[PDB]
Design goal:
The structure is cut from a larger assembly and holds 2 copies of chain A and 1 copy of chain C.
Chain A lengths: L2 H8 L30
Chain C lengths: L7 H17 L10 H15 L26 H6 L2 H5 L4 H22 L7
The chains are: A mainly alpha, C mainly alpha.
Chain B binds one RNA strand through helix 1, helix 2, helix 7 and helix 10.
Chain lengths: ~40, ~325, ~120
RNA sequence: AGUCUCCCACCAAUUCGUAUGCGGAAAACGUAAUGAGAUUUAAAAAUAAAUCAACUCAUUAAGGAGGAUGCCGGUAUUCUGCUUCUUGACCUGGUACCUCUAGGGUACUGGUGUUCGGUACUGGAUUCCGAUGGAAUCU
């Protein structure tokens, strides 16, 4: 969990790169967190 | 006529009135459905697509994609003579009566180019008779005594029973529950389809398909561009892959003229006739693999003998795997 | 013993952290766009920990080289999709935790890579 | 408009293989018939609590054949048969077998002893190899 490895990984890139947000046709919303319910 | 294909018991109970397409369980999660003409077909997806449809499927030159439609709802009737003589000449009369005198001519029979027009309903059996237009039709001739007809579902039965007035002389197969079809539109259409198809042997009709999948403006191609061959189970690839096409980029207008002379007639007919026979396409399923055994076969590729390749697609067996006939 | 037996007790921690994080929040993130890489990463880790789970080295085939292409062919994707969750802005703990985990995995995978040169085939 | 559900990757089967009154891919979804209850209750606050309506809950597989109640062979109603079929709980003890490398896998047969599975793909450009294949570089 050391940022040294993160710096080593980013060494295969620029200093401080910027990434775009997802295109709007590839986004999803979070569903519920509890298990599904059966019909009675 | 033929009934609904047997399948899962739970989901075959709901098809008492409106049938299902092969992909219905997939489309239902991503579209708005309706119910007409005995089918549960798809109307429109769940996003606004007015401009994207135009600039990816219209006649523009800004296309960088394609549109695919599951048109399995259009029926298929395979009519063929039974006089045992390849000259036929009675199916010719039926097709010339069914439509106007169009779909039985030197352009459509011998050159076997596709036909699109209007289909009537003749009733000449006692004195006074007439005709009334019904709708569009797709008639394709093969070996001068076999015909394939594609019709909108609504006019499927009315014409069909007409042919049944002469089943003493012809034979008909309501194969609408055994043959499926897909329609592709756009510029980069054949490029995407060719990224998910390989062959079993070496065939010239795949060489032409490989070469013509690099046009991007399909209006230049001539009237006839039929392809027909035998593919392998597309689940082997595990990912779509290009045809290494970037090497050759000097296609001109002189090789196109070769496509009108170097036409593989016999190699198309032989692979085509494995669709107009029920037992042939029954053998086509001879050993269809489950997902887990394909997974195990792929896993067996981490200990191959070349040891300097690192391949991903599984190999192909000579006789212990099925071959899928395919027409475009 | 330092060539091995000092890295394996670190993958033995990484796999447990990944498994806990997986079992924690499957339900509410199923349809997202980064399990298509998260489960691939977890499976590649599992296929590596399972080998060499004893008194000697039972290694007939040293070809897990083929299973160490998770650091040339399919490692840019996992790095470039675990930062999109950071950019989008609705969950930020997940992005940082995933990036730290990916850094740990890449470092350990090379640490296993260079120290072995028995690819004389 | 919201402190709410479901869908937007696949599965011939460690994945809801779920024929369950009817519709639906699914839903903290819709709707039909019979019948019954409200802190003294399956349950709400200490929806209803004269009637009808409203809230909640319980029961009810499709098709087709046979006989009868009613009215002109028929339909609405009522009781009795038939057809629909992919060797499928988990854990575990035995025998036989296997092209698997003393251990694994498969057949026949015994024991009550809240989220976890497998498989998979980045967009674009340039380059290299006697090819429906393989390899390297940049962005």
């Amino acid at each position: 969990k050391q940022l040294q490895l993160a710096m080593h990984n980013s060494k295969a890139a620029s200093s401080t790169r910027i990434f775009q947000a997802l295109p709007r046709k590839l986004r999803r919303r979070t569903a519920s967190h509890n298990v599904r319910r059966i019909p009675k | 006529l033929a009934p609904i294909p047997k399948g899962r018991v739970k989901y075959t109970k709901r098809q008492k009135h409106f049938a299902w397409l092969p992909t219905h369980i997939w489309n239902a999660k991503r579209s708005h459905m309706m119910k007409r003409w005995g089918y549960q077909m798809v109307w429109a997806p769940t996003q606004k697509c007015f401009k994207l449809t135009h600039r990816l499927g219209g006649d523009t030159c800004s296309s960088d994609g394609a549109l695919c439609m599951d048109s399995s709802y259009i029926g298929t009737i395979i009519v063929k003579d039974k006089s045992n003589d390849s000259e036929g000449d009675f199916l010719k009369s039926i097709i010339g009566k069914l439509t106007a005198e169009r779909a039985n001519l030197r352009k459509y029979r011998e050159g076997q180019v596709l036909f699109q027009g209007l289909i009537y309903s003749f009733n000449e059996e006692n004195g006074e008779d007439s005709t009334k237009p019904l709708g569009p039709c797709d008639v394709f001739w093969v070996q001068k005594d076999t015909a394939i007809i594609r019709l909108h579902p609504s006019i499927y039965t009315q014409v069909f029973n007409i042919l049944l007035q002469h089943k003493e002389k012809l034979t008909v197969q309501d194969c609408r529950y055994s043959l499926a079809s897909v329609t592709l539109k756009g510029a980069k259409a054949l490029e995407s389809l060719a990224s998910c198809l390989r062959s079993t042997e070496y065939s010239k009709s795949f060489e032409q398909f490989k070469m013509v999948s690099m046009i991007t403006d399909h209006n230049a191609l001539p009237q006839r561009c039929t392809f027909a061959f035998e593919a392998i189970d597309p689940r082997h690839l595990a990912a779509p892959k290009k045809l290494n096409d970037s090497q050759r980029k000097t296609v001109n207008s002189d090789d196109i003229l070769s496509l009108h002379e170097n036409y593989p007639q016999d190699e198309i007919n032989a692979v085509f006739n494995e669709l107009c026979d029920p037992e042939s396409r029954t053998q086509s399923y001879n050993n269809q693999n489950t997902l887990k055994e394909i997974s195990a076969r792929r896993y067996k590729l981490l200990t191959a003998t070349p040891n300097s390749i690192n391949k991903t697609t599984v190999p192909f067996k000579e006789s212990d795997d099925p071959s899928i006939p395919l027409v475009i | 013993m330092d060539e091995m037996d000092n890295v394996i007790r670190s993958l033995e921690q990484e796999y447990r952290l990944i498994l806990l994080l997986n079992h924690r929040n499957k339900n509410q993130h199923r349809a997202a766009s980064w399990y298509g890489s998260f489960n691939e990463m977890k499976r590649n880790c599992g296929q590596i920990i399972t080998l060499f789970s004893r008194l000697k080295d039972v290694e007939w085939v040293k070809l897990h080289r083929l299973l160490q292409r998770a650091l040339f062919r399919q490692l840019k994707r996992w790095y470039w999709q675990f930062n999109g969750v950071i950019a989008l802005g609705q969950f930020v703990t997940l992005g940082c935790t995933l990036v730290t985990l990916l850094a740990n995995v890449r470092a350990l995978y090379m640490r296993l890579w260079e120290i072995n040169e028995t690819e004389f085939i």
